[PDB]
Amino acid sequence: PHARRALCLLLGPDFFTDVITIETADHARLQLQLAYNWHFELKNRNDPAEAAKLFSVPDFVGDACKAIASRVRGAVASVTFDDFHKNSARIIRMAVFGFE
Amino acid sequence: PHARRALCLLLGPDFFTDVITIETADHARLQLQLAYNWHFELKNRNDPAEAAKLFSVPDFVGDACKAIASRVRGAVASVTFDDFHKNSARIIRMAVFGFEKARDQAVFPQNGLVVSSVDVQSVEPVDQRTRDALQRSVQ
Amino acid sequence: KARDQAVFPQNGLVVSSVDVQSVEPVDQRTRDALQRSVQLAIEITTNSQEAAAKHEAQRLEQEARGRLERQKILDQSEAEKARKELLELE
Amino acid sequence: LAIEITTNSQEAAAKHEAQRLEQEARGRLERQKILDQSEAEKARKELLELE
Numbered sequence A: 001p002h003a004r005r006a007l008c009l010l011l012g013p014d015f016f017t018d019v020i021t022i023e024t025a026d027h028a029r030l031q032l033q034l035a036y037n038w039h040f041e042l043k044n045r046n047d048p049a050e051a052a053k054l055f056s057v058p059d060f061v062g063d064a065c066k067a068i069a070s071r072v073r074g075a076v077a078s079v080t081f082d083d084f085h086k087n088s089a090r091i092i093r094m095a096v097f098g099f100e
Numbered sequence B: 001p002h003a004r005r006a007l008c009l010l011l012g013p014d015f016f017t018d019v020i021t022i023e024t025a026d027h028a029r030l031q032l033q034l035a036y037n038w039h040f041e042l043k044n045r046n047d048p049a050e051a052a053k054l055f056s057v058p059d060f061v062g063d064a065c066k067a068i069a070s071r072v073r074g075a076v077a078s079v080t081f082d083d084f085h086k087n088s089a090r091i092i093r094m095a096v097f098g099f100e101k102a103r104d105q106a107v108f109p110q111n112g113l114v115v116s117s118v119d120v121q122s123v124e125p126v127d128q129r130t131r132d133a134l135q136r137s138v139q
Numbered sequence C: 001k002a003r004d005q006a007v008f009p010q011n012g013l014v015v016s017s018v019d020v021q022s023v024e025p026v027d028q029r030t031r032d033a034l035q036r037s038v039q040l041a042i043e044i045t046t047n048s049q050e051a052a053a054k055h056e057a058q059r060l061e062q063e064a065r066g067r068l069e070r071q072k073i074l075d076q077s078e079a080e081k082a083r084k085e086l087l088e089l090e
Numbered sequence D: 001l002a003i004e005i006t007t008n009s010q011e012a013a014a015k016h017e018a019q020r021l022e023q024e025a026r027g028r029l030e031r032q033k034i035l036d037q038s039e040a041e042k043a044r045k046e047l048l049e050l051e
Helices: A048-053 A060-076 A081-095 B048-055 B060-076 B081-095 B128-138 C028-089 D002-050
Strands: A015-023 A029-037 B015-023 B029-040 B106-108 B113-125
Touching: A015 A060, A029 A060, A029 A081, A060 A081, A060 B015, A060 B029, A060 B081, A060 B113, B015 B060, B029 B060, B029 B081, B060 B081, B060 B106, B060 B113, B081 B113, B081 C028, B113 B128, B128 C028, C028 D002
Parallel strands: none
Antiparallel strands: A015 A029, B015 B029, B029 B113, B106 B113
């Protein structure tokens, strides 16, 4: 959670990776290296308030992966191992994003 | 409850973690890492009364986790292990927030602390023999 | 159906919430007993997995023979459409 | 002996459920079955005309 110090907040279209450890309904123990493509998006780069919002969350990465892990881990527990292994792609890609 | 002393009261959108130990109806011993994304929410920032309300609860974090563990631990006792293991996500997500299906933000009215979402990152059988029994289930 | 605050009148103290954080069987022997009850609780779930699984295989087995047996029928009748003609020549 | 009775009550309600589900199984299955046999008889009758 604290393993790196930094001074400039990188907001451009970088990605970060994570390794989560999740469990299926079948109680299959799984480990997934995920990458999350991310970028901050500032609609009013000039607005001094919305700029500072950028630094609102102390640990933007932490905040992010913390959430994405919870989201997957919670959803995969609801699915069968075989079923996951066959659909991982869209299971996650749906468990992370508010499906439409 | 008292392992960190501090001078500035952090009120902005941080998250704090906790590791609780809860029992299901099946008497499954479970241990969860919960993160609680939170923020204090002051409407009248300049009003000195509501400003000081920030320092009402002497241990805002304690009070918060204290209360959350009670809410989870209480509602997980009325639920079956397996049924929980399939719906942990929403079992907790409801037990922490007064359901309306659920609600999505808890307010602690004394100090104004708002808990915005719970991140259930890690849930484990405490007893080894139980985790073993499950291993054959996967087999 | 219950209440939410307990006012102690003598000194005005109010208890606003009871946070039951932990509850434990005091006797070791008891908590031993209950660990077997969970052993048999995933037992029942393990077995109901096994169960509804075998129940599937059987319905799949039913598709199998039930379709296959009809394909077989609709084959023999095609052969008969031929055998009759051959039986004319015969 | 108090957790005895509850521990055994879990087993009991489990087996009763197991059995109700078992009912679902044979119950549908044996009717899926009849609905195949009749479907085959729809074919077999025509075959018997050729036969």
